[model samples]
Target: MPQISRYSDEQVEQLLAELLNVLEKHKAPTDLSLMVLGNMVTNLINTSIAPAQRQAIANSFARALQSSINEDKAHLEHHHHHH
Candidate 1:
């Protein structure tokens, strides 16, 4: 699955660029890299946030992920048709 972030476009772009640079430097395997990041997110939510806030954040993240997936799918389909 494509990863989605809870950041604005500009923030996400910068974050991803930095992450890609680090990953490239370390030659990190894609699946393992994503798994590690996901684990860190889970840890942060579980350790620092209260129950109500965590639930709200989790719901928003879910919606954002769906939107991102749909957007990506549409973009790929459009490119395929034009080619």
Candidate 2:
């Protein structure tokens, strides 16, 4: 089953930007920021999704995070080589 998003993609992106702004305003440590963000998303899942769907949602989140990290690493490497 396809998981529907509660917010539109643009709204989600805007919210993400807002989160980044908050982190920047606080001068948040990267590790703590990650922990807080992870906890926030987990709580959202717990409150919003069915119990049976939680595992799937978590797995999807993990994969997406991994992919984003990999993409960032590749971009950094490419830019490093170009410089």
User: Which one wins on TM-score?
Assistant: 2
Off by over 4 Å in 2: 1-9, 71-83
Q: Which ranges in model 1 have alpha carbons more than 4 Å from their true place?
A: 1-12, 71-83
Mind sharing the TM-score for model 1?
0.62
lDDT of 2 by residue, 16-46 (tens): 8998999999999999998997898889999
Question: Which pairs, if any, clash in model 2?
Answer: none
Q: Local distance difference test, per candidate?
A: 0.82, 0.84
Model 2 lDDT on a 0 to 1 scale: 0.84
lDDT of 1 by residue, 1-83 (tens): 54464458678889889999898988999998999889988999998988779999888998988877864443434345654
**TM-score of every model versus the real structure:** 0.62, 0.64
Error of 1 at 46 (Å): 1.8
